[PDB]
Structure 1
Amino acid sequence: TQHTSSMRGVYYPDEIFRSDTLYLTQDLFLPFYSNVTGFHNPVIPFKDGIYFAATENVVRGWVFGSTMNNKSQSVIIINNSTNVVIRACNFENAFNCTFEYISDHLREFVFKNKDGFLYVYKGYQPIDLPSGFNTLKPIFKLPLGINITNFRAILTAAYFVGYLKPTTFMLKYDENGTITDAVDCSQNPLAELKCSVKSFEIDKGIYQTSNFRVVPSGDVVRFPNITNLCPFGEVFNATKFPSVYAWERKKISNCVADYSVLYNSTFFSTFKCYGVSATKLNDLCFSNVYADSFVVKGDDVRQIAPGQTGVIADYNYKLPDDFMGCVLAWNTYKYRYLRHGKLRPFERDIPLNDYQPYRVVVLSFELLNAPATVCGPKLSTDLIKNQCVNFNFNGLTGTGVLTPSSKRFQPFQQFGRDVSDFTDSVRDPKTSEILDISPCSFGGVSVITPGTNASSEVAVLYQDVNCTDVSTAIHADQLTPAWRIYSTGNNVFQTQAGCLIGAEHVDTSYECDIPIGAGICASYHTQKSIVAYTMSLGADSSIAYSNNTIAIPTNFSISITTEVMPVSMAKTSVDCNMYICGDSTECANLLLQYGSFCTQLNRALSGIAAEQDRNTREVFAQVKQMYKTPTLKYFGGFNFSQILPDPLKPTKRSFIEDLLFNKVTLQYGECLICAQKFNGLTVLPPLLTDDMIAAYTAALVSGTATAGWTFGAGAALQIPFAMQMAYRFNGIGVTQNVLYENQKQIANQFNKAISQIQESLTTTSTALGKLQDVVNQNAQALNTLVKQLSSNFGAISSVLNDILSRLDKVEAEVQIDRLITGRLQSLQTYVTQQLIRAAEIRASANLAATKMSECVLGQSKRVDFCGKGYHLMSFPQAAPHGVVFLHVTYVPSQERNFTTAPAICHEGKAYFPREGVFVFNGTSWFITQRNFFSPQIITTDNTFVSGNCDVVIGIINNTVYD
């Protein structure tokens, strides 16, 4: 039979206490929900380890071997009802053996074998195979030295066998220190998303996780038609050589060169190759090889090198300082000594001094400026077109697809290049056909999820591909992020952003929820599913233009809206010697060589810290005098109880401010007892406490409700609230009688809007997303900075104390220099990004100060500056790191249609309205204001006369009262 191993067989990775962490590690783990083969005693393979479990006493011991005969060592881990016995001999009597160890319900084991060690882990659990999660602890590792490719149980019969694979797990550690939960980061797209964001519960949105590749299939080698074997025998085993002043040069071409007859022997005294290595010469393909052969003294062979001095390398034989080639000499004749001037490289002169001798041969490789001729024995294969392969064209390697081309090469050219030095076309050395080279498919991978509290389904966007490509690559199992439990399905949709696998296409346009790209969104609609539509810009209407009709409102409504303004962020200092070095002194002296880094960095961070307090002072400290909150909070019917503090409570905040402070959900050292951390990171406290900001906003609300608008320009002057509201109605263009006659209705609409503001903040909707975004960005910057202290940047370890306790001084200098360089770079990145984010926060605080001046201390005429409507009055409330503005506006809401005229002609002269419009009641002509319907009779007081009535287009006849 076969069963599944659901979340079983996880073990403790190492021997270190951890608590309240999530830990990402790579080891050999049994993947989640994989197959097991239950037995109800065959020889079973042992590949990279197993997972053995036995539900029933009757099973005891194992035999781990290679051949399972008397010709290979085999280990027996048996139990004689009291003693665990381990032996490693040639069993079938035993002989010739090197290990011995005797020592004094579901049982579970993991056997792993690596580096000549057999790790064994064991767990126990009291209950086919169950479905729980259980964790395994180590028992013993044994220093055996044998391969294990088979195993067999020993019975004196219900056991299951899994198989381990190299995976990545994210392990959750308790507060006590035990592993309670884990995710397999290669099982689903969602599990990869959980591992990449390092959390178990994902929010809603679109997230980028990894990148995809299309792996190669074939392999293409093309080499020229060269058959003749190559004559190094003539060049090397030759009877006579010329003198060093008259060296000879021999050209080698159209030969297949072995090169293994030079470095397989001790025949040569020296073997120095420049620009290549000896072992790599059997794959490269050169154009011609030249051999310079001569005879020279013993202690002058060192002189034959790039950049030497003397007589041989000065008047006899000079090499250039870009030499690609090999220099040979072995134990076995004049030489020039006087001439006028130096030599140019590879030039000879035909004053001579006579000469243990050595024979020297110098090989220079002509590298691929022409068709290649001289290269080693590699086989050639046919070429594969329109497919991702690995190629090798005369030593020129790579990976990509090959396509017929339309370029036209000159006969002396062998390949074609690009701007960043990529070969993008090539000539086939056999058929002389031009091929283009393209990359295989790659890009990013996005995971679209509706939160991991409403579904566990996701969709995947493969960015910027045609996805018959990724459909065929998935079905042929050829993508690098290959997920074990994942089916493409029948929902594959091509967009301009790439293509979308897992979301279905509907024809109904909705407002955008999760944006994907070029007009496409996704959402979670009706079970439910993930849909993908074209976004809708707005809800349509039609208003009919006519040349003699106007629409005038017949009522209104009061609306209170909200604005969230971030103002400041959290203030940070870092100890540069504690982050970079710690307690060490060799590190301190080594870091002293870099000038002023830490002084300059502390200066930058201090400036950011001072700027945050300046922002807060600029927004809130805008009043000269502190007005006390009134005893009675009922001004003409307007209830101010929810925006002013209550004397019957211990705190200064109001009730809405309490909601706002509960809304935002806010390591490193900081204090309030005062603790510190080993990384040298703190957070500094602000100059103005929450109580002082609450005192500011309380005095602003009190001064508004008592003096109105007059304290932003001079001293405050008291005025009853209804007369203040009548002046504000007058300022938006409505007469005061509209207030005074409908005062009760306006008070009721105010109170109801305040109650809805309260209830919508209690509802736990994320209206405060900006202040949360401030919190999140700062925390993730500091987490990246602390996590950068685990990398070693090339050193043997990332710990300075290990390097300093296990190594001498002279190499500890090298390792500490590498760690110092990497950590200076990490701190520089942190400070640069903090400066840019401080600029953002300062612009936002400047806007908030402009709004407090122009909307709390006045009445603004600017359209949509302070709410949506006609602005009346506005109120400030404090939040964590911000301010919330409660704008009160006037909305004209009902309509009627009327017939209108520009002027009316009475006797011979035309009358125009003073302030208003002429409307037709249905019976007679009245005059009314624009923003409310209040018809008045047309008199001489509210009209003016200018001209004759023959010139205005659309003038009518009506009487005008005197």
Structure 2
Amino acid sequence: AYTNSFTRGVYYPDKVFRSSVLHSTQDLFLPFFSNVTWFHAIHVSGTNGTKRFDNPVLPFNDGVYFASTEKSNIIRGWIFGTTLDSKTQSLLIVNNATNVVIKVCEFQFCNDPFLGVYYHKNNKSWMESEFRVYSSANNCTFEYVSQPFLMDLEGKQGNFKNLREFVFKNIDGYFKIYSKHTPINLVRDLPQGFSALEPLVDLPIGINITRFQTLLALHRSYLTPGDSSSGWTAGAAAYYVGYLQPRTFLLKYNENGTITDAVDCALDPLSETKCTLKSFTVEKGIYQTSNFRVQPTESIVRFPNITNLCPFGEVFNATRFASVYAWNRKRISNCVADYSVLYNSASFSTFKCYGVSPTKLNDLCFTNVYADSFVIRGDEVRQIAPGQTGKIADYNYKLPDDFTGCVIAWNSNNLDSKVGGNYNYLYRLFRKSNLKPFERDISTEIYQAGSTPCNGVEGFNCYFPLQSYGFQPTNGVGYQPYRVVVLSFELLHAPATVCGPKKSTNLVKNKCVNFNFNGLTGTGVLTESNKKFLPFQQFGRDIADTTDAVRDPQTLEILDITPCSFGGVSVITPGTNTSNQVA
């Protein structure tokens, strides 16, 4: 069945005393009066009704609220896991008695996720029989066995007096279990008892959790004529599940220090009014709380159809790289550059860049890309950096201060250091002036050190500027030839050519979607544009630098971007002491 959550979904996010403050918290909560799915595991009392048994698989979102109404400790434990197989780990909890023993060990009992509490003949009473239903190998990491010894079941048929409230939330490989206990009265639904959930257990588990399962103890008196598991007429426990939502609660503490009341910030317009006003006393009058924002429906991605792999195989490993005094320009144009192989081929000693980030390199597009590959000393690998003044590398190769693009360096000991002497690698040692970043002085003249014309002759203070590298086959760590290649990612808004392919969703009009045009992560409706767009780049701008008119790369249709319906709510409310209806 389905019911509403009256006073459930609140827990201390970070425990602080918070003596009589109206705090504003943002965490994973359960919105009030929402759908909470009743799982009434009642014993079937009729010959026609179905056997009420509730251990179904429940998808596990980013957070889960759980509630167990109880009178005889029937509901015991919970289980998690991505798919509940030998491939993925599966947590579990056991509450056979007062002692709380738990595990993380993957034990596959998909056919029988049950537990057994059978009526023992010896000193006949309600005892536990089968707390072990595990039928697999462990291959596990974590363990926990708490043993306060107290044997208590206390079977009864009266009203469900106790209720345990839990929150199982996981983030950053950590599992947090908030728990609290409350004596309830009503048997058919959740009573109006407000309280928060104190944290008890935090466990590092490091497992992707997507599913959820529960354990029920089903076995009855031996006097029952038949199988106690197939036929059982004493089970009455029930439990409720609530998929936690990212909310922003306002928690009102008291003098004692516990959360007495709470208010949502999206439940009702008056609730949002109390959220903004930061109090529970909202007097008569118009209030302005938020704006009527329409969320995007889908996510259009627009990358060029063609899938020509960019020639990145011949830029990283090649036969010969020209020396630093004369470096090559590899212009990569109109192709797809799948960086997965550039991630698979991970042998780079140094990889730094100051513009785009390597995380977003895959889902980003570029218009011009130029690669400069060469070879340098072992101590020069740190000297190819913007702003880094080079003692000898400023004559040779400088990087722009506005440079955007990533550099790659790796040890070329196995390819460029050989017994052949490899003196063909040269570099400039001194010059009358320091070069600009993307200028290379491939010229080779004589140096007039000491203010004397050494025209053609190399004598004292007339040394040859183009000195060969002092390489040695398998030298020390600081003198190995390091082979490097830099990429100048031109981020100027021009028709993007060099980037990986994503799905090209069809164009849609008059529907604001989280579209993405070569990194342009805009969320607005699309329309046809009357004004003739430029034959050049597919980008447009306005006074506020928010793109207004663009053009698709695949089809030359002039698209107009406009953020969809935006307004502002204004809660018209009388005094809360008088009513709660607003306009």
Deviations 1:489-540 (A, max 9, x none): xxxxxxxxxxxxxxxxxxxxxxxxxxxxxxxxxxxxxxxxxxxxxxxxxxxx
**What does residue range 592-671 of structure 1 map to in structure 2 within 5 Å?**
none
Counterpart of 1:354 in structure 2: which amino acid?
S
> CA, structure 1 residues 208+309, in 2 after alignment: closer, same or farther (shift >3 Å)?
closer
Question: Percent same amino acid among aligned pairs?
Answer: 56
Partner residue of 1:109 out of 153, 164, 177:
164
**What does residue range 254-653 of structure 1 map to in structure 2 within 5 Å?**
254-310=334-390, 312-330=392-410, 331=412, 332=416, 333=424, 334-337=426-429, 339-347=431-439, 348-350=441-443, 351=446, 352-355=466-469, 356=471, 357-368=481-492, 370-459=494-583
Q: Decide whether the 8 Å contact of 2:184 with 2:191 is kept in 1.
A: no
State the alpha-carbon separation in 2 of the partners of residues 117 and 299 from structure 1: 48
Aligned to 1:246: 326
Offset of residue 376 of structure 1: 1.9
SS in structure 2 at match of 1:443: coil
State the alpha-carbon separation in 2 of the partners of residues 70 and 354 from structure 1: 62
Counterpart of 1:77 in structure 2: which amino acid?
N
State the alpha-carbon separation in 2 of the partners of residues 267 and 448 from structure 1: 64
Aligned to 2:183: 124
State the alpha-carbon separation in 2 of the partners of residues 4 and 301 from structure 1: 64
Offset of residue 37 of structure 1: 1.4
State the alpha-carbon separation in 2 of the partners of residues 141 and 38 from structure 1: 25
Partner residue of 1:63 out of 68, 77, 89:
77
Offset of residue 123 of structure 1: 0.8
- Which has more radius of gyration? 1
Aligned to 1:804: none
**What does residue range 653-732 of structure 1 map to in structure 2 within 5 Å?**
none
State the alpha-carbon separation in 1 of the partners of residues 372 and 502 from structure 2: 27
Q: Bigger CA drift: 165-174 or 105-114?
A: 165-174
Deviations 1:550-584 (A, max 9, x none): xxxxxxxxxxxxxxxxxxxxxxxxxxxxxxxxxxx
Q: Does 1:49 align with 2:64?
A: yes
Aligned to 1:25: 25
Offset of residue 207 of structure 1: 1.0
TM-score, length basis structure 2:
0.68
> CA, structure 1 residues 135+164, in 2 after alignment: closer, same or farther (shift >3 Å)?
farther
> CA, structure 1 residues 268+191, in 2 after alignment: closer, same or farther (shift >3 Å)?
closer
State the alpha-carbon separation in 1 of the partners of residues 13 and 427 from structure 2: 70
Q: Decide whether the 8 Å contact of 2:332 with 2:369 is kept in 1.
A: yes
Aligned to 2:287: 207
SS in structure 1 at match of 2:329: strand
State the alpha-carbon separation in 2 of the partners of residues 223 and 362 from structure 1: 25
State the alpha-carbon separation in 2 of the partners of residues 320 and 178 from structure 1: 58
Higher RCO structure (Cα 8 Å, ≥6 apart): 2
Q: Decide whether the 8 Å contact of 2:9 with 2:65 is kept in 1.
A: no
Higher percent of residues as helix = 1
> CA, structure 1 residues 140+327, in 2 after alignment: closer, same or farther (shift >3 Å)?
closer
Deviations 1:423-468 (A, max 9, x none): 2111211211111111122232210012223332110xxxxxxxxx
Counterpart of 2:144 in structure 1: which amino acid?
F
> CA, structure 1 residues 303+202, in 2 after alignment: closer, same or farther (shift >3 Å)?
closer
Deviations 1:622-647 (A, max 9, x none): xxxxxxxxxxxxxxxxxxxxxxxxxx
> CA, structure 1 residues 380+107, in 2 after alignment: closer, same or farther (shift >3 Å)?
same
> CA, structure 1 residues 452+387, in 2 after alignment: closer, same or farther (shift >3 Å)?
same
State the alpha-carbon separation in 2 of the partners of residues 399 and 141 from structure 1: 41
Deviations 1:746-802 (A, max 9, x none): xxxxxxxxxxxxxxxxxxxxxxxxxxxxxxxxxxxxxxxxxxxxxxxxxxxxxxxxx
State the alpha-carbon separation in 1 of the partners of residues 388 and 366 from structure 2: 27
Deviations 1:368-402 (A, max 9, x none): 45433222232322111111112222233222111
State the alpha-carbon separation in 2 of the partners of residues 443 and 123 from structure 1: 44
> CA, structure 1 residues 283+451, in 2 after alignment: closer, same or farther (shift >3 Å)?
same
Q: Decide whether the 8 Å contact of 2:7 with 2:195 is kept in 1.
A: no
SS in structure 2 at match of 1:202: coil
Counterpart of 2:538 in structure 1: which amino acid?
Q
Q: Does 1:165 align with 2:244?
A: yes
Counterpart of 1:107 in structure 2: which amino acid?
N
Offset of residue 312 of structure 1: 4.8
Q: Does 1:76 align with 2:88?
A: no
Offset of residue 131 of structure 1: 4.3
Q: Decide whether the 8 Å contact of 1:78 with 1:84 is kept in 2.
A: yes
Deviations 1:98-120 (A, max 9, x none): 33223245211112223334332
Q: Decide whether the 8 Å contact of 1:244 with 1:295 is kept in 2.
A: yes
Deviations 1:257-287 (A, max 9, x none): 1234344335333323242233432233223
State the alpha-carbon separation in 1 of the partners of residues 385 and 13 from structure 2: 54
Q: Decide whether the 8 Å contact of 1:43 with 1:152 is kept in 2.
A: yes
State the alpha-carbon separation in 2 of the partners of residues 324 and 201 from structure 1: 54
Q: Decide whether the 8 Å contact of 1:29 with 1:165 is kept in 2.
A: yes
Aligned to 1:813: none
Offset of residue 122 of structure 1: 0.5
SS in structure 2 at match of 1:416: coil
Counterpart of 2:147 in structure 1: which amino acid?
I
Aligned to 1:780: none
State the alpha-carbon separation in 1 of the partners of residues 343 and 267 from structure 2: 50
State the alpha-carbon separation in 2 of the partners of residues 142 and 341 from structure 1: 63
RMSD value, Cα: 3.4
State the alpha-carbon separation in 1 of the partners of residues 100 and 385 from structure 2: 65
> CA, structure 1 residues 312+361, in 2 after alignment: closer, same or farther (shift >3 Å)?
farther
Q: For structure 1, which runs of at least 5 residues remain unmatched after alignment?
A: 460-962
> CA, structure 1 residues 311+447, in 2 after alignment: closer, same or farther (shift >3 Å)?
closer
SS in structure 2 at match of 1:457: coil
Q: Decide whether the 8 Å contact of 2:307 with 2:501 is kept in 1.
A: no
Q: Decide whether the 8 Å contact of 1:307 with 1:320 is kept in 2.
A: yes
Counterpart of 1:349 in structure 2: which amino acid?
I
Partner residue of 1:135 out of 195, 200, 222:
195
Counterpart of 1:120 in structure 2: which amino acid?
S
SS in structure 2 at match of 1:261: helix
> CA, structure 1 residues 376+162, in 2 after alignment: closer, same or farther (shift >3 Å)?
closer
Counterpart of 1:378 in structure 2: which amino acid?
K
State the alpha-carbon separation in 2 of the partners of residues 297 and 172 from structure 1: 65
Q: Does 1:237 align with 2:331?
A: no
> CA, structure 1 residues 200+296, in 2 after alignment: closer, same or farther (shift >3 Å)?
closer
Counterpart of 1:246 in structure 2: which amino acid?
A
Q: Decide whether the 8 Å contact of 1:111 with 1:119 is kept in 2.
A: yes
Aligned to 2:297: 217
Q: For structure 2, which runs of at least 5 residues remain unmatched after alignment?
A: 43-52, 108-131, 151-158, 221-235, 417-423, 447-465, 472-480
Aligned to 1:601: none
> CA, structure 1 residues 406+60, in 2 after alignment: closer, same or farther (shift >3 Å)?
same
TM-score, length basis structure 1:
0.43
SS in structure 2 at match of 1:78: coil
SS in structure 2 at match of 1:149: strand
